[PDB]
A paper describes a structure:
We also present a 3.3 Å resolution cryo-EM structure of the homo-heptameric mechanosensitive channel MscS from E. coli. His-tagged MscS was purified in DDM, reconstituted into peptidiscs using the on-beads method and further purified by SEC. The final map reached a resolution of 3.3 Å, close to the resolutions of 2.9 Å and 3.1 Å of the recently published cryo-EM maps of MscS reconstituted into nanodiscs. As MscS in nanodiscs, our map of MscS in peptidiscs shows the channel in the closed conformation, with perfect seven-fold symmetry that could be docked into our map using Chimera, followed by refinement in PHENIX. However, unlike the map of MscS in nanodiscs that resolves bound lipids, our map of MscS in peptidiscs, like the X-ray crystallographic structure of detergent-solubilized MscS, does not show any density representing lipids associated with MscS. In the case of MscS, the peptide densities are organized very differently from those seen in the MsbA maps. Importantly, all helical segments run essentially parallel to the membrane plane and form a continuous band of helical segments, surrounding the transmembrane domain of MscS at a level corresponding to the cytoplasmic leaflet of the membrane. A second continuous band is also present at the level corresponding to the periplasmic leaflet of the membrane, but these helical segments appear shorter and less well defined in our map. Thus, unlike in the case of MsbA, the arrangement of the peptidisc peptides surrounding the MscS channel is reminiscent of the double-belt model proposed for how MSPs encircle the lipids in nanodisc. Similarly, MscS in peptidiscs adopts the expected closed channel conformation, showing that the peptidisc environment does not exert major strain on this mechanosensitive channel.
Author numbering:
A (entry chain A), B (entry chain B), C (entry chain C), D (entry chain D), E (entry chain E), F (entry chain F), ...: 27 to 280
The structure:
């Protein structure tokens, strides 16, 4: 009877010294690893309150008090902390998944669901990537894994799609001749792949030719800019008119 | 009383020699399987902390301290890891579902909810597919199973829909005659299927004929381009005018 | 004391032979039914690891070690696999619900929440349906049950709605006379149902008559196309003008 | 010792014969009710595997093996089936709620969050409703309860809102006189309720009068069509002009 | 030994008679209060199956069979019914909270996240409200509590905002004089509150004055209509022009 | 044996009298605090059913239910109530957060994710706030914590941004001179802060100057209105034209 | 027998004095910390009711009444409070994550998914940040972690993108010469990085040159404004016309 009481006080004193030991130990461990001391002491007070809660419940169990009430409420409070940390630990799990199944490496130009940039680093909780215009975007890993990963650096060839609106009076064969001469005289265009120049659309004010052209993934934007400037030059020289928005107006004297 | 004593320490030392050996074993196993050697030791430290937690709880239970507090908090922490890994393990389950119920195979041109490409591979956690313009999209499997799978390589015949806007003054029977001559003289159009040429819409500035035409799944875009170019040529030759946006203007000199 | 040790090793050996024979049996059942070998051996390794986990826990319990730690973590790992498989087993439950409460059968042209096609088959995890333009859409059953099911093959008679924009100067009674003559002389229109021709809207540039017309579900699109072509013909013959977008211009010379 | 073994084999044989008899009984109970046999045999195999799992667990417990691991994993698999059936059983609960608290009955024209039609039947898992244009929409009950229920057949009177755009030069008092004569000479308009004819908006090209008019729920669309046709007739007769889109243009030079 | 068997059959017979009496009593209670019997018989069959399940597994426990596997599956089926009834019970909890914290009473014109109407009644599961145009909307209580409650009947004074577009040629001080004379000569406008007449915006074709004016919550729409009609009258009398959409057109004849 | 019977009937009678006492006390406390007799009687009936459920189970346990059948079902029914209560008391937790972290509690004009107004009161489940146009919006606290809080009375100085579109013929230095004279002669503009007058955009028909100007949080709307009216006055006085939507028009033949 | 009754009353009295002392102690602890007593007494009454509930259940267990029913309902109520506090404790966990993995510090101009401003402080539950236009936005931490963190202060160099629309008649080489002279004569433009001046687009009415220019993060907006004003000045001096929206008008003249 009193043996359970002295055993319970023994559990209390060993639990308090273990609580102070583990609390100060994780204080030292987060001062050494991390930098902050305020939230380190906050988490250390959380762990200290956890160990003294564990040992107070174990002591009230050693006395003989049926202790399942605080067991159920402490389990639901741990489950509260669990459904809280669902997002952060999901970022952790997506991070280890994204570094063991790696669809991008540090330097691969990707498009992670609406933002596109070169991956500077894949950390444990987030990938830092630098945008094309200098912005640093720190995307969490759950937002990456839960969406698509459009990797632009895994295939060495990509495809420019030019859409040229010419007038309806413009001859289809002359436009196709000039566009084929432009995309054939250009050296960075892969000739062994698709080189489509065909009438894509009968537009409202114009008529739209599509020019689908494969090139290297590094020369892609320069092929777009050079073939577009050459299209403008050769079309203005050859008399083919890029039309303005056209209206037919039926005038009426009131 | 002493039977619980150092026999509990025998449990706590038979557990540490299992914890270290299982940590070293999963380090060697994941170095053999998928080398990272930097989050591999983190997962090994997680498994080590789990096994030493199991054996510390079992040793405190063998002594006589009623362990149901750390049991409930460890179960809630396991459920935290569970609701964390909900997304990744749902990708795994959707991957084994997608490879045992396979709606696409490696090479089938599909459309998985807004992105469309040829599936290069269906891995365990993601399908890599190459877009029509060269981009590699690594879609997770839960995002595929949670949405539609529009497969273009399962049926060998598909349907082009042309919408030709002609002027309101143009004769309906002449447009239907010329469009039927275009879709009948074209050989890749399946003649035993639907060949609809009918007045679809009375538009604002135009009047829209629909041309629904069945052709083979490989010949489909070429049928679209050739029949559209032939429509432009034969309509310009026959005098039917594709109209511009039309306005009726009632000018008022003020 | 040692009786529990030899009993624990007995549970160990019967569990290892059970872990071999159940894994071999599910390899048999997955090679015969739903044929695959790689992910079938993956699932077999999962079932083998599960059975050896069950029997290692049972052996450590039969020895005398309080084993509730791995019980709670294994229950939370089962709950991890459960909240993972939530989506796939919800597709399973929605599939058996969709086939025992069947709102569509194999062949019924439906509209399952933004995609519309004829249901080729209702499988256990997904309905395959062929779109009107040849595409095969494999919709999961949870996405079908969680949204509406617009069935076009359940009523034999449906309703075309024409909206004819005529000019503001056109006589309302002449337009109603001509539209009623068109929808009365057409034989596939159900005359015993609603045949509405009334002035629907005072539009911006036009004035919109509505023509609500009931006809059979197979003849519906042909009734639409024939009555629309007849509307264009008879309105052009009778002098009623479908107007262009109208502007009133008050020009004032700066 | 061996008494527990023969008792365990007794539980094994009574559970196997109970599993076979209850699988045959649930097969009869489904084939009499829902006359699909394939998914009936699937659910029967599920119930058979569940009861033989129950009795294998009970036998391994009666032998003396601590059968807590398979109980925890089986409870988590029951929770897998539970979070799976969350959607379908939520449709069931919303169906019994929607038929015991019934905001619509079979025949009542409603608008269940988007789609709008007359409810043909409220079943247990879904309400079938027929749209105004003939389409059958089978809406699940959770989608109905989770959204608004805009019931049109609960109140016998409703309100038409005409918006008449007249020119800026038109006299406000003459428009209000003519609109009040139109909405007063019409007999299906409830005269004891609100009859608003007032200047609602100073539009861009027009000026918008609102006409808010109460009438019976069956006469509502006919009141709209007749008062709109009368508005067009009397406004064209009295010289009030529904204006086209108006532009003030300041002409300039090159 | 046989004492447990006769005790188990005793629990069987008392549980079957309690199951029949509670099933028939719940059926009678759902007849006298919930007149529909087609789902009352189903709910009573559910309660009957539940009580016979409880007493069958209680008798299987009283025999001596370790029964804690069907306890886990039954407690997961109860949690299936729980996560099913999550929506309906959330409507019940939001209803009792919406009637003990009442932000609207029966008759108060509100806007419950989108739809807006006068609350006819707040029931336990839904608030019925009549729209301004006669429609009856039965909003569930979880959708009300989860969103905003814009109550228009809690403050007796509200604010009209007129936005008058005048021409750029119009004098600012004359427009402000006429608008201030209109909003000062009007008696239902609260003169002790804000009366703003100031230049709000330099629009594309016009220039927009804002007139923010406080008036009583019942007189608000009539103040809007009377001040807008007076603005049109006084501005047409004073020569200030409400401008049409303006274009500056540069002639480029060739 | 019969001692457990008389003890069970003792538990029955003490539980029934405690049920009546606690239900009467809860009805007293609810008719004192949160007065509504109908739903307080409903909640007291729920608490009465709960206490008679607890005591019927606790009495029938010793003569019966054999380790937690009805307890395992009642715990899941408690969690059924608990998911409803998590949806509702997420507002209570957010309310005690919103009071102990005090982001707007005094009456500060804020913008709580969309709607914006002066906070009338922060209650326990909702913040009532009065909009700028008189509407009372009762936002729940979970909707506030789940979104941003844009507090306008936390910083005493804020920023007006004028965007002035002038013509392309306007001299940039003259526009910058006049705008700097307007924003320098105005006394409520903070001159020690940013005063930006620079060419923001080359518009389609205009050219847009940005005027970023810091002023006090009370004087800000009056600074906007006064500087905008002064911009219109001085720009019309100095010959700088606010352009209409310009449109170069190239004439053609029929 | 009576020893359990006097022990139960002992637990009752020690739990009541412990409940009063912990309730008043957390009143004192919060009044020292956060000095709203009105919710401090609310939380203190919650903790008092929790401790008296724990000790009432412990006393009913020490008497001998099987008390697992209220254990299950109290655990489900703890899970109700936990899943209610899910969002608040997720903000807490995201706050300690955001301060131990800090992607922004106090002062770093960021864009936290939409809103963008300089982070004034990162607290435990929210980050306060001041917008560029003076507004104070208190973003919760879970909303920050759940989205991207676009940090503008981590890289010292960023990129302006000018899009200059010139006329179609303008010479491409003259525009590229003038734009290269502007972006080369400007000193704050980083010349060792990308300096792109190339033909980006053939627009509808214009033709769009892109000018991608790298400059320091503090000089970025001033580089944009200075190069845009210089583009307007030098282009008007050199005769290059920024075109208005262009229409081609075909006179039909009825």
């Amino acid at each position: 009877y009193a043996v359970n009481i002295v055993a319970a006080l023994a559990i209390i004193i060993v639990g308090l010294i273990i609580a102070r030991m583990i609390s100060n130990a994780v204080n030292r461990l987060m001062i050494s690893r991390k930098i902050d001391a305020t939230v380190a002491d906050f988490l250390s007070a959380l762990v200290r309150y956890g160990i003294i809660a564990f040992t107070l419940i174990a002591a009230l169990g050693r006395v003989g008090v049926q202790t399942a009430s605080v067991i159920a409420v402490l389990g639901a409070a741990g489950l509260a902390v669990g459904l809280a940390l669902q997002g952060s630990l999901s970022n952790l799990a997506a991070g280890v998944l994204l570094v063991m199944f790696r669809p991008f490496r540090a330097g691969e130009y990707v498009d992670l669901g609406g933002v596109a940039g070169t991956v500077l680093s894949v950390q444990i909780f987030s990938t830092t990537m630098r945008t094309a215009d200098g912005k640093i975007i720190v995307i969490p890993n759950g937002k990456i894994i839960a969406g698509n990963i459009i990797n632009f650096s895994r295939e060495p060839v990509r495809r420019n799609e030019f859409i040229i609106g010419v007038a309806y009076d413009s001859d289809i064969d002359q436009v196709k001749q000039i566009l084929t001469n432009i995309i054939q005289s250009e050296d960075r265009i892969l000739k062994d792949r698709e080189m489509t120049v065909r009438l894509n659309e009968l537009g409202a004010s114009s008529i739209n030719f599509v020019v689908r052209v494969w090139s290297n993934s590094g020369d892609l934007q320069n092929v777009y800019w050079d073939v577009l400037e050459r299209i403008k030059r050769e079309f203005d020289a050859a008399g083919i008119s890029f039309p303005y928005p056209q209206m037919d107006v039926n005038f009426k004297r009131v």
